[PDB]
Structures are given as structure tokens and as C-alpha cells.
Amino acid sequence: MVNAEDLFINLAKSLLGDDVIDVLRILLDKGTEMTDEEIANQLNIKVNDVRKKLNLLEEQGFVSYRKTRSGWFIYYWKPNIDQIN
């Protein structure tokens, strides 16, 4: 990898905003699943615009989610970078 945590943040940019690239980041950082809340709490931004970014990337394929049902369904996000290789 090495030049893939960038060849990733680059393919993103040239495709979506930058508002988005910020999200993909925290993900690439933590290195384990995250949830709009998290990506929103430890960043500081409306969880709404956070989820807005996620679905935009998701649509392109820079992230994948999993909703797993303590009452309440939950979606977890991860960076599809390994798939990039």
C-alpha cells in the first residue's frame, strides 16, 4: 500500500467535494468501523451532513456500511481501501 491512503484520498477528491474527503480521513485513521455519530462526535459537525458525506462516497465506493440491530438498528462504516487493492 503506502501510496494508497492517498491514491484513495485523491480519487475521492477528483470525484466528490472536499467536504467529503474530510470524512474518509477519520475513517482511514481510526482503522476500524465507525458510525456517523462517532465520525461526527470526534470531529465536530452535524451528524446529518456527516451522513450526507458518507452516502455520497458510499455511492462511489470509497466506503461500505453494515446495519446491525439494546433496541435500535445501527449502520457502521468502513473504508473500502483493501478493495482498492
Side-chain angles (χ1 to χ4, degrees):
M1 186 162 301
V2 181
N3 352 308
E5 194 193 62
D6 286 311
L7 158 62
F8 192 52
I9 300 186
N10 177 49
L11 281 163
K13 283 167 187 162
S14 183
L15 280 163
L16 308 170
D18 295 40
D19 286 44
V20 144
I21 274 62
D22 303 289
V23 153
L24 204 59
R25 281 303 308 151
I26 291 61
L27 286 174
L28 290 171
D29 303 306
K30 193 186 172 185
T32 326
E33 332 185 76
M34 294 213 75
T35 184
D36 52 352
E37 307 179 80
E38 268 202 306
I39 310 169
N41 189 301
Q42 314 175 178
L43 253 207
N44 308 66
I45 41 170
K46 278 196 174 62
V47 191
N48 244 198
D49 175 61
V50 179
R51 307 206 241 59
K52 283 173 188 169
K53 282 152 194 179
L54 289 172
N55 307 344
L56 263 162
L57 287 145
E58 176 287 307
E59 167 201 66
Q60 305 307 141
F62 293 75
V63 160
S64 278
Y65 69 94
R66 109 165 176 310
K67 57 155 36 179
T68 297
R69 276 177 292 119
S70 52
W72 264 182
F73 64 106
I74 314 173
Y75 296 75
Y76 285 80
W77 306 83
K78 208 175 173 183
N80 300 343
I81 180 173
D82 257 302
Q83 290 174 57
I84 253 301
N85 320 313

Coordinates of all heavy atoms in Angstrom, one line a residue:
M1 N 0.8 -1.2 0.0 CA 0.0 0.0 0.0 C 0.9 1.3 0.0 O 1.5 1.6 -1.0 CB -0.9 0.0 1.2 CG -1.9 1.1 1.3 SD -3.3 0.8 2.4 CE -3.9 -0.8 1.7
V2 N 0.9 2.0 1.1 CA 1.7 3.2 1.3 C 1.1 4.4 0.5 O 0.6 5.3 1.1 CB 3.2 2.9 0.8 CG1 4.0 4.2 1.0 CG2 3.8 1.8 1.6
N3 N 1.2 4.3 -0.8 CA 0.7 5.4 -1.6 C -0.8 5.1 -2.0 O -1.2 5.5 -3.0 CB 1.5 5.6 -2.9 CG 2.7 4.7 -2.9 OD1 3.5 4.8 -1.9 ND2 2.9 4.0 -4.0
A4 N -1.5 4.4 -1.1 CA -2.9 4.0 -1.4 C -3.8 4.7 -0.4 O -5.0 4.8 -0.7 CB -3.0 2.5 -1.4
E5 N -3.3 5.3 0.7 CA -4.1 6.0 1.6 C -4.1 7.4 1.1 O -4.5 8.4 1.8 CB -3.6 5.9 3.0 CG -4.6 6.4 4.1 CD -3.9 6.6 5.5 OE1 -3.1 7.5 5.6 OE2 -4.3 5.9 6.5
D6 N -3.7 7.6 -0.1 CA -3.6 8.9 -0.8 C -4.2 8.7 -2.2 O -4.9 9.6 -2.7 CB -2.1 9.4 -0.8 CG -1.6 9.9 0.5 OD1 -2.3 10.7 1.2 OD2 -0.5 9.5 0.9
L7 N -3.8 7.7 -2.8 CA -4.3 7.4 -4.2 C -5.8 7.1 -4.0 O -6.6 7.0 -4.9 CB -3.6 6.1 -4.7 CG -4.3 5.3 -5.8 CD1 -4.4 6.1 -7.1 CD2 -3.4 4.0 -6.1
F8 N -6.2 7.1 -2.7 CA -7.6 6.9 -2.3 C -8.2 8.3 -2.1 O -9.3 8.5 -2.6 CB -7.6 6.0 -1.0 CG -8.9 5.5 -0.7 CD1 -9.7 4.8 -1.6 CD2 -9.4 5.7 0.6 CE1 -10.9 4.3 -1.2 CE2 -10.7 5.1 1.0 CZ -11.4 4.4 0.0
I9 N -7.5 9.1 -1.3 CA -8.0 10.4 -1.0 C -7.9 11.4 -2.2 O -8.3 12.5 -2.2 CB -7.2 11.0 0.2 CG1 -7.3 10.1 1.4 CG2 -7.6 12.5 0.5 CD1 -6.7 10.7 2.7
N10 N -7.2 10.9 -3.2 CA -7.1 11.6 -4.5 C -8.2 11.2 -5.5 O -8.8 12.1 -6.1 CB -5.7 11.3 -5.1 CG -5.4 12.0 -6.4 OD1 -5.7 13.2 -6.6 ND2 -5.0 11.2 -7.4
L11 N -8.5 10.0 -5.6 CA -9.5 9.5 -6.5 C -10.8 10.1 -5.9 O -11.8 10.3 -6.7 CB -9.6 8.0 -6.5 CG -8.6 7.2 -7.4 CD1 -8.6 5.8 -7.0 CD2 -9.0 7.3 -8.9
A12 N -10.9 10.2 -4.6 CA -12.1 10.8 -4.0 C -12.3 12.2 -4.5 O -13.2 12.5 -5.2 CB -11.9 10.8 -2.5
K13 N -11.3 13.1 -4.1 CA -11.4 14.5 -4.4 C -11.8 14.7 -5.9 O -12.9 15.2 -6.1 CB -10.0 15.1 -4.3 CG -9.6 15.5 -2.8 CD -8.1 15.8 -2.7 CE -7.7 16.0 -1.2 NZ -6.2 15.9 -1.0
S14 N -11.0 14.2 -6.8 CA -11.3 14.3 -8.2 C -12.7 13.8 -8.6 O -13.1 13.9 -9.7 CB -10.3 13.6 -9.1 OG -10.6 13.8 -10.5
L15 N -13.4 13.3 -7.6 CA -14.8 12.8 -7.8 C -15.8 13.5 -7.1 O -16.9 13.8 -7.6 CB -14.8 11.3 -7.5 CG -14.3 10.3 -8.6 CD1 -14.0 8.9 -7.9 CD2 -15.3 10.2 -9.7
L16 N -15.6 13.8 -5.8 CA -16.5 14.5 -5.0 C -16.0 15.8 -4.5 O -15.0 16.3 -5.0 CB -16.9 13.6 -3.8 CG -17.4 12.2 -4.0 CD1 -17.5 11.5 -2.7 CD2 -18.7 12.1 -4.7
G17 N -16.6 16.3 -3.4 CA -16.2 17.6 -2.9 C -14.8 17.5 -2.2 O -13.8 16.9 -2.8
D18 N -14.7 18.1 -1.0 CA -13.6 18.1 -0.2 C -14.2 17.9 1.2 O -13.6 17.4 2.1 CB -12.9 19.4 -0.3 CG -12.3 19.7 -1.6 OD1 -13.0 19.3 -2.6 OD2 -11.1 20.2 -1.7
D19 N -15.5 18.4 1.2 CA -16.3 18.3 2.4 C -16.3 16.8 2.7 O -16.4 16.4 3.9 CB -17.7 18.7 2.1 CG -17.9 20.2 2.0 OD1 -17.0 20.9 1.3 OD2 -18.9 20.8 2.6
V20 N -16.3 16.0 1.7 CA -16.3 14.5 1.7 C -14.9 14.0 2.2 O -14.9 13.2 3.1 CB -16.7 13.9 0.4 CG1 -15.9 12.6 0.1 CG2 -18.2 13.6 0.4
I21 N -13.9 14.4 1.5 CA -12.5 13.9 1.8 C -12.2 13.9 3.3 O -11.4 13.1 3.8 CB -11.4 14.7 1.0 CG1 -11.2 14.1 -0.4 CG2 -10.1 14.7 1.8 CD1 -12.5 14.1 -1.2
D22 N -12.8 14.9 4.0 CA -12.6 15.0 5.4 C -13.1 13.8 6.2 O -12.5 13.4 7.2 CB -13.2 16.3 6.0 CG -12.7 17.5 5.2 OD1 -11.6 17.9 5.5 OD2 -13.5 18.1 4.4
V23 N -14.2 13.3 5.7 CA -14.9 12.1 6.4 C -14.0 10.9 6.1 O -13.7 10.2 7.1 CB -16.3 11.9 5.8 CG1 -16.7 10.4 5.9 CG2 -17.3 12.8 6.6
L24 N -13.7 10.6 4.9 CA -12.9 9.4 4.5 C -11.7 9.4 5.4 O -11.2 8.3 5.7 CB -12.5 9.5 3.0 CG -12.2 8.2 2.4 CD1 -13.4 7.3 2.4 CD2 -11.8 8.4 0.9
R25 N -11.2 10.5 5.8 CA -10.0 10.7 6.6 C -10.1 10.0 8.0 O -9.5 8.9 8.2 CB -9.7 12.1 6.8 CG -8.9 12.8 5.6 CD -7.7 12.0 5.3 NE -6.8 11.9 6.5 CZ -6.0 10.8 6.7 NH1 -5.9 9.9 5.8 NH2 -5.3 10.8 7.8
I26 N -10.9 10.5 8.9 CA -11.1 9.9 10.2 C -11.2 8.4 10.1 O -10.7 7.7 10.9 CB -12.4 10.4 10.9 CG1 -12.4 11.9 11.2 CG2 -12.7 9.6 12.1 CD1 -12.2 12.8 10.0
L27 N -11.9 8.0 9.1 CA -12.1 6.5 8.9 C -10.7 5.9 8.6 O -10.3 5.1 9.4 CB -13.0 6.3 7.6 CG -14.5 6.5 7.7 CD1 -15.1 6.4 6.3 CD2 -15.1 5.6 8.7
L28 N -10.0 6.4 7.6 CA -8.7 5.8 7.3 C -7.8 5.9 8.5 O -6.8 5.1 8.6 CB -8.1 6.6 6.1 CG -8.7 6.4 4.7 CD1 -8.2 7.4 3.7 CD2 -8.4 5.0 4.3
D29 N -8.1 6.8 9.4 CA -7.3 6.9 10.7 C -7.6 5.9 11.7 O -6.8 5.0 12.0 CB -7.6 8.3 11.3 CG -7.3 9.5 10.3 OD1 -6.2 9.5 9.8 OD2 -8.2 10.3 10.1
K30 N -8.9 6.0 12.3 CA -9.3 5.0 13.3 C -8.9 3.6 13.0 O -8.5 2.8 13.8 CB -10.8 5.1 13.6 CG -11.2 4.4 14.9 CD -12.7 4.4 15.1 CE -13.1 3.5 16.2 NZ -14.6 3.4 16.4
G31 N -9.0 3.2 11.7 CA -8.6 1.9 11.2 C -9.6 0.8 11.6 O -9.3 -0.4 11.4
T32 N -10.8 1.2 12.0 CA -11.9 0.2 12.4 C -13.2 0.9 12.2 O -13.2 2.2 12.3 CB -11.7 -0.3 13.8 OG1 -10.3 -0.3 14.2 CG2 -12.3 -1.6 14.0
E33 N -14.2 0.2 12.0 CA -15.6 0.7 11.8 C -15.9 1.9 12.6 O -15.5 2.0 13.8 CB -16.7 -0.3 12.1 CG -16.3 -1.8 11.9 CD -17.5 -2.7 12.1 OE1 -18.3 -2.7 11.2 OE2 -17.6 -3.3 13.2
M34 N -16.7 2.8 12.1 CA -17.2 4.0 12.7 C -18.6 4.3 12.4 O -19.2 3.6 11.5 CB -16.3 5.2 12.3 CG -14.8 5.1 12.8 SD -14.1 6.7 13.2 CE -14.9 7.0 14.7
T35 N -19.3 5.1 13.1 CA -20.7 5.4 12.8 C -21.0 6.9 12.8 O -20.5 7.6 13.7 CB -21.6 4.8 13.9 OG1 -23.0 5.0 13.5 CG2 -21.4 5.4 15.2
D36 N -21.7 7.4 11.8 CA -22.0 8.8 11.7 C -21.8 9.5 13.0 O -21.1 10.5 13.1 CB -23.4 9.1 11.2 CG -24.5 8.3 11.9 OD1 -24.1 7.5 12.8 OD2 -25.7 8.6 11.7
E37 N -22.4 9.0 14.1 CA -22.2 9.6 15.4 C -20.7 9.9 15.6 O -20.3 11.0 15.6 CB -22.8 8.7 16.5 CG -24.2 8.2 16.4 CD -24.6 7.3 17.6 OE1 -24.9 7.9 18.7 OE2 -24.6 6.1 17.4
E38 N -20.0 8.8 15.8 CA -18.5 8.9 16.0 C -17.8 9.8 15.1 O -17.2 10.8 15.5 CB -17.9 7.5 15.9 CG -17.8 6.7 17.1 CD -16.7 5.6 17.0 OE1 -16.7 4.8 16.1 OE2 -15.8 5.5 17.9
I39 N -17.9 9.6 13.8 CA -17.3 10.4 12.8 C -17.7 11.8 12.9 O -17.1 12.8 12.4 CB -17.6 9.9 11.4 CG1 -17.4 8.4 11.2 CG2 -16.8 10.7 10.3 CD1 -18.0 7.8 10.0
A40 N -18.8 12.0 13.7 CA -19.4 13.4 13.9 C -19.0 13.9 15.3 O -18.7 15.1 15.4 CB -20.9 13.3 13.8
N41 N -18.9 13.0 16.3 CA -18.5 13.5 17.6 C -17.1 13.9 17.7 O -16.7 15.0 18.1 CB -18.8 12.4 18.7 CG -18.7 12.9 20.1 OD1 -17.6 13.3 20.5 ND2 -19.8 12.8 20.9
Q42 N -16.2 12.9 17.4 CA -14.7 13.2 17.4 C -14.2 13.9 16.2 O -13.1 13.8 15.8 CB -14.0 11.8 17.5 CG -14.6 10.8 18.5 CD -14.0 9.5 18.4 OE1 -14.3 8.6 19.2 NE2 -13.0 9.3 17.5
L43 N -15.1 14.8 15.7 CA -14.7 15.7 14.5 C -15.3 17.0 14.7 O -14.7 18.1 14.5 CB -15.3 15.1 13.2 CG -14.3 14.4 12.2 CD1 -15.0 14.5 10.8 CD2 -13.0 15.1 12.2
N44 N -16.6 17.0 15.2 CA -17.4 18.2 15.4 C -18.0 18.7 14.1 O -17.4 19.4 13.3 CB -16.6 19.3 16.1 CG -15.8 18.8 17.3 OD1 -14.9 17.9 17.2 ND2 -16.2 19.3 18.5
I45 N -19.3 18.3 13.9 CA -20.1 18.7 12.7 C -21.4 18.0 12.9 O -21.6 16.9 13.5 CB -19.4 18.2 11.4 CG1 -18.8 16.8 11.6 CG2 -18.4 19.2 10.9 CD1 -18.4 16.1 10.3
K46 N -22.4 18.6 12.2 CA -23.8 18.0 12.3 C -23.8 16.5 11.7 O -23.3 16.3 10.6 CB -24.8 18.8 11.5 CG -25.3 20.0 12.3 CD -26.6 20.6 11.7 CE -27.2 21.7 12.5 NZ -26.3 22.9 12.7
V47 N -24.2 15.6 12.6 CA -24.3 14.2 12.2 C -25.0 14.0 10.9 O -24.9 13.0 10.2 CB -25.0 13.3 13.2 CG1 -24.8 11.8 12.9 CG2 -24.5 13.6 14.6
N48 N -25.9 15.0 10.5 CA -26.7 14.9 9.3 C -25.8 15.1 8.1 O -25.8 14.3 7.2 CB -27.7 16.0 9.4 CG -29.1 15.5 9.4 OD1 -30.1 16.2 9.1 ND2 -29.3 14.2 9.7
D49 N -25.0 16.2 8.1 CA -24.1 16.5 7.0 C -23.0 15.4 6.9 O -22.3 15.3 5.9 CB -23.5 17.9 7.1 CG -22.5 18.2 6.1 OD1 -22.8 18.2 4.9 OD2 -21.3 18.5 6.4
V50 N -22.8 14.7 8.1 CA -21.8 13.7 8.2 C -22.4 12.5 7.4 O -21.6 11.9 6.6 CB -21.6 13.3 9.6 CG1 -20.6 12.2 9.7 CG2 -21.2 14.5 10.5
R51 N -23.6 12.2 7.6 CA -24.3 11.1 6.9 C -24.4 11.4 5.5 O -24.5 10.5 4.6 CB -25.6 10.7 7.5 CG -25.7 10.5 9.1 CD -26.9 9.6 9.4 NE -27.9 10.3 10.3 CZ -28.5 11.4 10.0 NH1 -28.3 12.0 8.8 NH2 -29.4 11.8 10.9
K52 N -24.5 12.7 5.2 CA -24.7 13.1 3.8 C -23.4 12.8 3.0 O -23.5 12.4 1.9 CB -25.0 14.6 3.8 CG -26.5 14.9 4.1 CD -26.8 16.4 4.3 CE -28.2 16.5 4.8 NZ -28.6 17.9 5.2
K53 N -22.3 13.1 3.7 CA -21.0 12.8 3.0 C -20.9 11.3 2.8 O -20.7 10.8 1.7 CB -19.8 13.3 3.9 CG -19.6 14.8 3.8 CD -19.0 15.4 5.0 CE -19.2 16.9 4.9 NZ -18.6 17.6 6.2
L54 N -21.0 10.5 3.9 CA -20.9 9.1 3.8 C -21.7 8.4 2.6 O -21.1 7.7 1.9 CB -21.4 8.4 5.1 CG -20.4 8.6 6.3 CD1 -21.0 8.1 7.6 CD2 -19.1 7.8 6.0
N55 N -23.0 8.8 2.4 CA -23.7 8.2 1.3 C -23.2 8.6 0.0 O -23.4 7.8 -1.0 CB -25.2 8.5 1.4 CG -25.8 8.2 2.8 OD1 -25.3 7.4 3.6 ND2 -27.0 8.7 3.0
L56 N -22.6 9.7 -0.1 CA -22.1 10.3 -1.4 C -20.8 9.4 -1.8 O -20.7 9.1 -3.0 CB -21.7 11.7 -1.3 CG -22.6 12.8 -1.7 CD1 -22.2 14.1 -1.1 CD2 -22.6 13.0 -3.3
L57 N -20.0 9.2 -0.9 CA -18.8 8.4 -1.1 C -19.2 6.9 -1.4 O -18.8 6.3 -2.3 CB -17.9 8.4 0.2 CG -17.1 9.6 0.6 CD1 -17.1 9.7 2.1 CD2 -15.7 9.5 0.1
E58 N -20.1 6.5 -0.4 CA -20.6 5.1 -0.5 C -21.1 4.9 -1.9 O -20.8 3.8 -2.5 CB -21.8 5.0 0.5 CG -22.6 3.7 0.5 CD -23.4 3.5 -0.8 OE1 -24.3 4.4 -1.0 OE2 -23.3 2.5 -1.4
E59 N -21.8 5.8 -2.5 CA -22.3 5.7 -3.8 C -21.2 5.5 -4.8 O -21.4 4.7 -5.8 CB -23.1 7.0 -4.2 CG -23.4 7.2 -5.6 CD -23.6 8.6 -5.9 OE1 -22.7 9.4 -5.8 OE2 -24.8 9.0 -6.3
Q60 N -20.0 6.1 -4.6 CA -18.9 5.9 -5.5 C -18.1 4.7 -5.2 O -17.5 4.0 -6.0 CB -18.0 7.1 -5.4 CG -18.7 8.4 -5.7 CD -19.5 8.3 -7.0 OE1 -20.6 8.8 -7.1 NE2 -18.9 7.7 -8.0
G61 N -18.1 4.3 -3.9 CA -17.4 3.1 -3.5 C -16.1 3.3 -2.7 O -15.2 2.5 -2.7
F62 N -16.1 4.4 -1.9 CA -14.9 4.7 -1.1 C -15.2 4.3 0.4 O -14.4 4.5 1.2 CB -14.6 6.2 -1.1 CG -14.2 6.7 -2.5 CD1 -15.1 6.9 -3.5 CD2 -12.8 6.9 -2.7 CE1 -14.7 7.3 -4.8 CE2 -12.4 7.3 -4.0 CZ -13.3 7.5 -5.0
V63 N -16.4 3.8 0.6 CA -16.9 3.3 1.9 C -18.0 2.3 1.7 O -18.7 2.3 0.7 CB -17.4 4.5 2.7 CG1 -18.2 4.1 3.8 CG2 -16.2 5.3 3.3
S64 N -18.1 1.4 2.7 CA -19.2 0.4 2.7 C -19.8 0.4 4.1 O -19.1 0.7 5.1 CB -18.7 -1.0 2.4 OG -18.5 -1.2 1.0
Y65 N -21.1 0.1 4.2 CA -21.7 0.1 5.5 C -22.3 -1.3 5.9 O -22.4 -2.2 5.0 CB -22.8 1.2 5.7 CG -24.0 1.0 4.8 CD1 -25.1 0.4 5.4 CD2 -24.0 1.4 3.5 CE1 -26.3 0.1 4.6 CE2 -25.1 1.2 2.7 CZ -26.3 0.6 3.3 OH -27.4 0.4 2.5
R66 N -22.8 -1.4 7.1 CA -23.4 -2.6 7.6 C -24.4 -2.2 8.7 O -23.9 -1.6 9.7 CB -22.4 -3.6 8.1 CG -22.3 -3.8 9.6 CD -21.5 -5.1 9.9 NE -21.3 -5.3 11.4 CZ -20.9 -4.4 12.2 NH1 -20.6 -3.2 11.8 NH2 -20.7 -4.7 13.5
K67 N -25.6 -2.5 8.5 CA -26.6 -2.2 9.6 C -26.8 -3.4 10.4 O -27.3 -4.4 9.9 CB -27.9 -1.7 9.0 CG -28.6 -2.6 8.0 CD -30.1 -2.3 8.0 CE -30.4 -0.8 8.1 NZ -31.9 -0.5 8.1
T68 N -26.5 -3.3 11.7 CA -26.7 -4.4 12.6 C -27.6 -4.0 13.8 O -27.2 -3.1 14.6 CB -25.3 -4.9 13.1 OG1 -24.6 -5.4 12.0 CG2 -25.5 -6.1 14.1
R69 N -28.7 -4.7 13.9 CA -29.7 -4.5 15.0 C -29.0 -4.6 16.4 O -29.2 -3.7 17.2 CB -30.9 -5.4 14.9 CG -32.0 -5.0 13.9 CD -33.1 -6.0 13.8 NE -32.7 -7.2 13.1 CZ -32.7 -8.4 13.6 NH1 -33.2 -8.6 14.9 NH2 -32.3 -9.5 12.9
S70 N -30.6 -4.4 23.0 CA -30.5 -3.0 23.0 C -31.1 -2.3 21.8 O -30.4 -1.8 20.9 CB -29.0 -2.5 23.2 OG -28.2 -3.1 22.2
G71 N -32.4 -2.2 21.8 CA -33.2 -1.6 20.7 C -32.6 -0.5 19.9 O -32.1 0.5 20.5
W72 N -32.6 -0.6 18.6 CA -32.2 0.4 17.6 C -31.1 -0.2 16.6 O -30.0 -0.6 17.0 CB -31.6 1.6 18.3 CG -32.6 2.8 18.4 CD1 -32.3 4.0 19.0 CD2 -33.9 2.8 18.0 NE1 -33.4 4.8 18.8 CE2 -34.4 4.1 18.2 CE3 -34.8 1.9 17.4 CZ2 -35.7 4.5 17.9 CZ3 -36.0 2.3 17.0 CH2 -36.5 3.6 17.3
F73 N -31.5 -0.1 15.4 CA -30.7 -0.5 14.2 C -29.5 0.4 14.0 O -29.7 1.6 14.2 CB -31.6 -0.4 12.9 CG -32.0 1.0 12.6 CD1 -31.4 1.7 11.6 CD2 -33.0 1.6 13.4 CE1 -31.7 3.0 11.3 CE2 -33.3 3.0 13.1 CZ -32.7 3.6 12.1
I74 N -28.4 -0.2 13.7 CA -27.2 0.7 13.5 C -26.4 0.4 12.2 O -26.3 -0.7 11.8 CB -26.3 0.6 14.7 CG1 -27.1 0.6 16.0 CG2 -25.3 1.7 14.7 CD1 -26.3 0.4 17.2
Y75 N -25.9 1.5 11.6 CA -25.1 1.4 10.4 C -23.7 1.7 10.8 O -23.4 2.6 11.6 CB -25.5 2.4 9.4 CG -26.9 2.3 8.9 CD1 -28.0 2.6 9.6 CD2 -27.1 1.8 7.6 CE1 -29.3 2.5 9.1 CE2 -28.4 1.6 7.1 CZ -29.5 2.0 7.8 OH -30.8 1.9 7.3
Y76 N -22.8 0.9 10.3 CA -21.4 1.1 10.6 C -20.6 1.2 9.3 O -20.9 0.5 8.3 CB -20.8 -0.1 11.4 CG -21.2 -0.1 12.8 CD1 -22.4 -0.6 13.2 CD2 -20.3 0.3 13.8 CE1 -22.8 -0.7 14.6 CE2 -20.6 0.2 15.2 CZ -21.9 -0.3 15.5 OH -22.2 -0.3 16.9
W77 N -19.7 2.2 9.3 CA -19.0 2.5 8.0 C -17.5 2.1 8.1 O -16.9 2.0 9.2 CB -19.1 4.0 7.7 CG -20.5 4.4 7.7 CD1 -21.3 4.7 8.7 CD2 -21.4 4.4 6.5 NE1 -22.6 4.9 8.3 CE2 -22.7 4.8 6.9 CE3 -21.1 4.2 5.1 CZ2 -23.7 4.9 6.0 CZ3 -22.2 4.3 4.3 CH2 -23.5 4.6 4.7
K78 N -17.0 1.8 7.0 CA -15.6 1.3 6.8 C -15.1 1.8 5.5 O -16.0 2.1 4.6 CB -15.5 -0.2 6.9 CG -14.2 -0.8 7.5 CD -14.3 -2.3 7.6 CE -13.0 -2.9 8.0 NZ -13.0 -4.4 8.1
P79 N -13.8 2.0 5.3 CA -13.2 2.5 4.0 C -12.9 1.3 3.1 O -12.2 0.4 3.5 CB -12.0 3.2 4.5 CG -12.2 3.5 5.9 CD -12.9 2.3 6.4
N80 N -13.5 1.3 1.9 CA -13.2 0.2 1.0 C -11.8 0.2 0.4 O -11.7 -0.2 -0.8 CB -14.3 0.1 -0.1 CG -15.7 0.0 0.5 OD1 -15.9 -0.4 1.6 ND2 -16.7 0.3 -0.3
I81 N -10.8 0.6 1.1 CA -9.5 0.7 0.6 C -8.9 -0.7 0.3 O -8.3 -0.9 -0.8 CB -8.6 1.5 1.5 CG1 -7.1 1.5 0.9 CG2 -8.6 0.9 2.9 CD1 -6.2 2.4 1.7
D82 N -9.0 -1.7 1.2 CA -8.5 -3.0 0.9 C -9.0 -3.5 -0.4 O -8.3 -4.2 -1.2 CB -8.9 -4.0 2.0 CG -7.8 -4.3 3.0 OD1 -6.7 -4.8 2.6 OD2 -8.0 -4.1 4.2
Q83 N -10.2 -3.1 -0.8 CA -10.8 -3.5 -2.0 C -10.1 -2.7 -3.1 O -10.1 -3.1 -4.3 CB -12.3 -3.2 -2.0 CG -13.2 -4.1 -1.1 CD -14.6 -3.7 -1.0 OE1 -15.4 -3.6 -2.0 NE2 -15.1 -3.4 0.2
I84 N -9.5 -1.6 -2.8 CA -8.8 -0.8 -3.7 C -7.5 -1.5 -4.1 O -6.9 -1.2 -5.1 CB -8.4 0.6 -3.1 CG1 -9.3 1.7 -3.8 CG2 -6.9 0.9 -3.3 CD1 -9.2 1.8 -5.3
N85 N -7.2 -2.6 -3.4 CA -6.1 -3.4 -3.7 C -6.6 -4.8 -3.8 O -6.8 -5.3 -4.9 CB -5.0 -3.3 -2.6 CG -4.8 -1.9 -2.1 OD1 -4.7 -1.0 -2.8 ND2 -4.8 -1.8 -0.8

